[PDB]
Symmetry: D4
Subunit: 187 residues, 8 copies
């Protein structure tokens, strides 16, 4: 029941405008407005071609883009959104204050004081978050087991089947292992 999938996952074009809370990348003829942390905007230079990994949020009366330097960050954004009470604006505020690397450690360390330093986040609030996602921020194995659970399998069920595929083909990809694990799992 975990909410994850949007449509526009990045925008690449010429920077038309760099503001303090967003940017305007022109892809094709369209100027998309993507909001962003100053940290992100910082690297941007009007007149230059640039790409931002974006997350798209559609609501009944809204259709907005949030951009980031890379996928890891964007993904972090989405994660933040999962905590109830934490909305896009909020999440952006936190990242604006604490870059992805920092914000990640802040949570994993359990560092609450750092979080309260972010407007909108109450003492109680900081805790819930750290709880919700301290343990949420070539391997091959953990990648493929991770995915089989999304297709609605179990942890154990998926780990059995995975060791199995690798037990037979060690030098296999993270993809051909997936298909071999599934072609295996549909009996």
């Amino acid at each position: 029941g975990r909410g994850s999938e949007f449509m526009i996952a990045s925008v690449r074009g010429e920077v038309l405008e760099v503001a303090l809370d967003h940017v305007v990348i022109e892809a094709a003829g369209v100027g998309y407005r993507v909001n962003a942390t100053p940290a992100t905007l910082a690297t941007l230079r009007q007149g230059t071609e640039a790409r931002l990994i974006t997350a798209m949020i559609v609501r009944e009366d809204s259709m907005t883009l949030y951009g980031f330097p890379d996928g890891e960050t964007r993904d972090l954004f989405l994660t933040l959104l999962s905590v109830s009470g934490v909305g896009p604006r909020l999440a952006m505020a936190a990242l604006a204050v604490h870059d992805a690397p920092a914000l990640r450690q802040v949570l994993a360390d359990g560092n609450v004081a750092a979080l309260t330093r972010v407007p909108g986040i109450g003492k109680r609030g900081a805790e819930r978050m750290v709880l919700e996602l301290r343990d949420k921020v070539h391997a091959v194995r953990s990648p493929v087991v991770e995915a089989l659970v999304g297709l609605g399998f179990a942890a154990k069920q998926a780990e059995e089947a995975t060791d199995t595929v690798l037990a037979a083909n060690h030098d296999a990809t993270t993809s051909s292992a997936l298909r071999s694990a599934l072609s295996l799992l549909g009996k």
Copy 2:
């Protein structure tokens, strides 16, 4: 009353990212995220130009793409969605487990055991599906009636007319066959 029509029916561009449950095709300047079965993702190679026949799902708070190698598969996806209780994720799960060819036979054969092996599908569930669509997976003759049918007509009426036109002009194409018929039924 059958739900069928979307807007983005395909995306062609450069592959920016190949994941385990989706891909990112960059069309124009935009990186569209389309979800896909590993089977589909398998053929894809980052840095290469590629095209996926997609189905688009819009909901109040969501706007998602599902991609597939070809039209037949994508159409199969839509079909699956018709069964109540069966949602996009579910349908993708099934195709992820059983490729289109396989999944098709699984239904036509009536093969229930195969279906239950798909997470989220209960014994009762598998049956309903097989029921709902065992008989749903230059012809010229049947596509024309199929058209008329969706224009909200009836299977004798539009059958008789298609029959009638293919009778009088033999070197006629599925579409000229379609217009000719429509000219008749609007009682010229």
Copy 3:
């Protein structure tokens, strides 16, 4: 309170697929599916570049395109939609049976029998429609005052103005007339 304005008013690209009830035009990299009457689809040829004047319909759980050879037809489509009880599909059915020219006369003539010939349209239904829009299917003076009225003005004020501008620059474009008339009405 009359509903009129959408966003995608046309699509130009390569025809990827011509079906019996729609087409797939590829603009940029995107393959847009626009539905269409066989009459319209008829002219289309896969592999060829083509343009369709489209009407866009967005609903909570839907986002669809309807395409047409020209603006006059597309506009007629929208009109049809205005009649309550008449939905996009219905409207398309009617045009599929009666081309724009025909369908227009069918209404203006008041020809009800022709309309009932269209699935979904009952006897009662045909009448309401003919009622609703029998009187609804280089000029210059008329278009401008109409636009102004369209902004909430009063035909007299809007004639005074227009007549003024046109008297001053007889060879005026309809549009310059519009600017030049409003430039007047703020005083």
Copy 4:
């Protein structure tokens, strides 16, 4: 709680149609319809490439674009929308009658008679507006603190932090301040 952010902030392409209340710019292959004042449409020439800074409005049953020559104007549009009772059509009507420069002075002067000259705007109406936004139509200190306040801070804290930064780098820019002020504000 102030509503501000959309997605399509401009459209650049070839002008396909210039009407009296809108234009059709073709970006990529798509013809986007953006509504506009005759004043704006005036400068436009079919067959020519053009760009309009747009504001996008999405509602349950609607998805519309409004275009303008530049950012200042488009922003003014959004502002007008903030006044309750004032909708997109209305706001467009006012700008159609009074160009941005004019319309701005009209409000700052407090000139009510001018506003009532716009259909849909009652006497009472004109006042509310002038009220709501008479005081709303290398600087550096201010821009910066404005931003923070937007990130949810308080004018006190935002300023305090800021003098503190610019102290340390009088040389600073409007953004390089912003970050340092955020570094600062994070108790680093």
Copy 5:
């Protein structure tokens, strides 16, 4: 597809307040507000027990009652609402001006001038209405077919059957006539 069915079809209690556009009937302990034409309100007397045949309108953000002296009138109200463009307030305005008997003749006569005299109704408007419902304002025979008709049948089918039953049992009531017919069409 015709919209007809609500929940509160009447309110009986003590009149607590008689206004110019509504009344407050207290049923049980609850004071229901039902709106009404002065014509209707006219008969009402505060402190007295009274009953109004009501029509209930629920919308996302609204839950309102409209009351009338009798069923025929209330039903007339609903009818008016069927015409698109005609809302509850409008319909109440018309009845407020023209009592049910009058308003009925106004339509059946086709009398357009009378209708335009009602605020909100334009010349074009009056016509559409007269069109839409000039032919819409122990019978035993027609109520039975009327029933079947709303059960989603057709006017020959249900006509033939009603015909057929009234033929074989003569001392039969509109309802026994209804069941008997339904027993037939479910192909006993």
Copy 6:
């Protein structure tokens, strides 16, 4: 995820009006309109006090009551509604044609011809329904474990419990069994 619970489950008052498709029961001072099959309406007599077991349906722009002679029938109504494509009106049509007893056998027998005899029900439609609910139309042990499972428990835990309580108080009511079994499962 199964939709079941409403608020007005019955109405008792004086019959003010008996029509062909509904009745008006006056409870307290309010005249509630409940729709009903002629079969149901048949038994009703204006001027008499009567009670109808009702199902309530609320939608954004609607608030309607459907009434029935007894609980078993009303419940059957709800069931019918579960089949997608089958709306309140439809469901009422079916019951109007086939009384509860009949309509129940029609499904359990699998009798499709009978169902198509009902307007709005297509051949395809009849089948789906029979599929969906052929196996869906003083016990004691069964009702309790079922309720417990109904709260998310596991038949085994819920049998252990029940069996325990019933072994201890054989003459137990189904309900006391329920309390006494849960009083157990918190430990």
Copy 7:
């Protein structure tokens, strides 16, 4: 386009509970919760029969009652709601602080300081309100002219017709004047 009409306009029963922000009146068997100012609650006494003139607010996910000692107050409540930015809770807060009589003068006097004394109301806010409704807080004439405008007539049009009716029947009611004015206005 002015929003005014609800359904439950009062509740009369036995007071079951008197709290600090609401009360529970039991009408028939139902305990309705109506929210109220302490000022209002003050007069209330549990175990006693009481009546509160109520305003009902229904929203997609809400159905709430607000009660008041009399109609004038309740009506004032509704008025407050008309100011955008001012919600039920807010309006109640203001009345909780300033009784109807007081709150009325506060607005008519134009007294802004008094309004800012109410939590949630900013300086800017207080002004808008005073603006919006300073001129909004047996005559016979003004009553009946007031009503004809709601039926969608004009001020002048309605005043002409009204003087007319009274010019002919001075000793007429505020009601028989209304019908005589309308029976007159439908020509």
Copy 8:
């Protein structure tokens, strides 16, 4: 921004049906269905007059009642609903398993094992809850200030005002304070 207020806060009538997951109380002529824990249903006896303190939940497509023996319990129900992820069915499940007294201690003790004993509640889930409301399950000073805070005031102001009042009338009641504190707070 805390969600609290409904309309039907109790139902009193004759018990028409006692089930395993709900009851049917007939108030006036209406049979209201209120859902309840077996614990609660236990005390109920068909044919008898009874009262349940209820909480009402209205959603776009739903309108449901949940009943409880007393106010403290019903309030506890609402509380549980505040935890995101915890819905009416869930909350009812927990109370069904753990009576109000028990369930209260379970949280205040911080007893997680007990909570996981409730279907739908995961390990992670139990923690969040205990977190969210361990400190949430003639006094006079406090009640009073609580109220004000509810009217939008700030704990500082609310208290300050309050000591100031009770100073002037040590004798005061929880409400007669409230008003005076509001008199006060209005700068009288």
